[PDB]
Amino acid sequence: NFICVDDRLFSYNFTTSGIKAKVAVDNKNVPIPCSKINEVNNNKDVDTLYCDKDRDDIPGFARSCYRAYSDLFFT
């Protein structure tokens, strides 16, 4: 259950607290192209990093996460 955003793969998790988005990264923390969206969805054993203002090692991460949350309303 991953979608494409800014050429990145994002998933969503929730509970009784809130909905958080997480991005799929390779073992170097480089996000995985949308050109591999099919394998990621079939073989879902990938590194995932939750959206967080404090995570700094992915450029434009805050913008891609905002987009992901937006796309849950303005589809």
Which residues in this chain contact Cl ion in the complex, by CB under 5 A? 26-28, 59-60, 62-63
Between CA 46 and CA 8 the distance in angstroms is 13
Q: Whose structure tokens read 């967080």?
A: 52
- In the Cβ-directed half-sphere of 20, how many Cα atoms lie within 13 Å? 12
Between CA 9 and CA 11 the distance in angstroms is 7
- Tokens representing 70 are 């937006």
